Amino acid sequence: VNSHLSELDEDVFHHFGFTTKSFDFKEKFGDVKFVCVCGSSGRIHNFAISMAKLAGLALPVENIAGSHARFVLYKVDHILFADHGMGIPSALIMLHEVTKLLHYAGCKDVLFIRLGTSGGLGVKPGTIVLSDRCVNTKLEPYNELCILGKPVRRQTIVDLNTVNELKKLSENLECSVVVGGTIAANDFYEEQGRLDGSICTFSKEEKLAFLQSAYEHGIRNMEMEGTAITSHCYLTGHRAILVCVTAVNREGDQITISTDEFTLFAQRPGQLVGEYLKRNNGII
Amino acid sequence: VNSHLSELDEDVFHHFGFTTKSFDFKEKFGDVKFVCVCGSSGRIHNFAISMAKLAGLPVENIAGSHARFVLYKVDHILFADHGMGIPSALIMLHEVTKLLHYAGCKDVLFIRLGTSGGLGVKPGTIVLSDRCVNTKLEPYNELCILGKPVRRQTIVDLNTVNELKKLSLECSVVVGGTIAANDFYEEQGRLDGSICTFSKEEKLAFLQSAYEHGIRNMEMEGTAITSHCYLTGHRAILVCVTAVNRLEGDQITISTDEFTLFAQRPGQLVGEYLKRNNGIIV
Ligand SMILES: O=c1cc[nH]c(=O)[nH]1
Ligand SMILES: O=c1cc[nH]c(=O)[nH]1
């Protein structure tokens, strides 16, 4: 743990717009055992409302975050909900402030579940990929950080037990569900091998060779936060999984599916997860 | 220009929620010469509102329904948000520069109106970036393209920076270097994250070393903006207010209202600049 936190009289959660004096953290958050997150405030809120319906809470699902917060925060029974924007650095802001919240509240062994969207590798659009490993662009199982100007690597650890549980649950439940490797990229375009960005320094042939070699090593999708979430949670004593839908066969680059078809796909991770939460005391 | 764009019948701006078939891009965006951006949709919306009122002209979102980003236009100025962090900024950068190209816009100025941590300056200070560097203090944006390391020089429109300093309020305006970090906490040398593997002395050493090399503030996007724009034939500057003196602490202790006040200061300077240099029609 970070003993420097003892130096504070009050901790300001800058991006959630509240402080440790805003509530009794033990009282308000102490019962939390799950944290559902995704890059969209709308989507994660939508998932929270669905979970409140499943659990029988009728009162609206309201934002806990303060006025000028960057992130939203919801609570349904023993489940916390938050967004985290796009990319590893945004996700780390969420991760730091949420895990401090959990610690202050005395929450232990919490499960973080990322309900994201991604680009697939050799799988049809609509496919849910349960990550068996989050890996960087060089296919290395680490989150890279540069702390105080010095390079740090942090091993990526997926909750394989929960992942296998999810796979088994999926076998008993409108799409394909695949366990495979997941690429985490700091770019939506060039580093993910897209030819249709504003800047491109490689040919199609060079793109494909990069993608197949990734595929051959078992990669099934590509997104932008995985290495951050599955490395951080483990390091802070919690568990994490990625359950991501794919929006394209990286056959091409463009996301050509309609907005509504996309909305449909992006809810598929929530569908599987909601049942898993339902069967494992996420809700009363 | 990426020739691969010609292989597309339609180009989908996924994160803005429209496509090349949504508008006549030449007609709709052709007169744009400025793009003002920041991490907050609300702040940039309010800024666009302020500029429209200044120009004596409802500022409606051009971006689609399920979009991650907002997009507004007031006369010759585009406004958009970009979340937090280099990867999220790159998303905005790719899609907006592609939009500018489809519109036939050339040599456009990107202006990031941000918040940051100050090094050795008082909170509420405006820092005009004369360089954007990484956490290793290199004036480059690092990328990993097709699994291979690539470095891109960061170019700040220093001519515009000089003009802004001359133009310049209840605050100081400083020209200095700007660190872009891939984190708010550990990579910025904060002691108050959920994880911290260093001491106060190692923190200060990191920041003093940065300060000695001219750095005056620290944020999370600068190297992305100032490398990408130069490579796509455009110009870029950062105008960021400071919210804390990082040599004195990490926590943002100023009130929400005061933070909001500070965060509007870059717009005060830049807004007057835009009025003077045909950003809006006067
Ligand atoms: O193809 C995709 C879709 C979502 N996010 C990504 O990083 N890539
Ligand atoms: O210290 C700060 C303040 C705002 N934004 C940052 O990235 N860092």
Side-chain angles (χ1 to χ4, degrees), chain A residues 207-210 212-215 217-218 221 223-224:
Chain A
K207 159 197 173 172
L208 270 327
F210 177 52
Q212 288 116 26
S213 181
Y215 181 88
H217 285 86
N221 66 323
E223 47 92 61
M224 298 178 290

Side-chain angles (χ1 to χ4, degrees), chain A residues 117-120 185 187-188 192 194 223-224 247-248 250 253 255, chain B residues 14-15:
Chain A
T117 65
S118 80
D187 186 324
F188 182 89
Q192 203 183 314
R194 255 169 187 101
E223 47 92 61
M224 298 178 290
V248 70
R250 291 304 319 283
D253 287 334
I255 311 296
Chain B
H14 182 58
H15 301 82

Side-chain angles (χ1 to χ4, degrees), chain A residues 2 12 97 154 190-191 254, chain B residues 12 144 152 185-186 193 251:
Chain A
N2 178 15
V12 180
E97 295 191 7
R154 293 180 172 165
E190 290 193 88
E191 296 198 3
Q254 294 267 308
Chain B
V12 174
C144 204
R152 297 184 172 165
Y185 287 93
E186 294 186 87
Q251 291 265 300

Side-chain angles (χ1 to χ4, degrees), chain A residues 14-15 70, chain B residues 112 115-118 181 183-184 188 190 218-221 241-244 246 250 252 259:
Chain A
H14 179 54
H15 299 86
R70 304 304 179 98
Chain B
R112 161 157 157 67
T115 63
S116 57
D183 184 358
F184 181 89
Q188 297 198 25
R190 285 195 147 77
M218 180 180 299
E219 46 86 55
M220 295 174 70
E221 288 92 58
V241 74
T242 68
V244 63
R246 292 294 315 293
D250 302 317
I252 314 296
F259 185 95

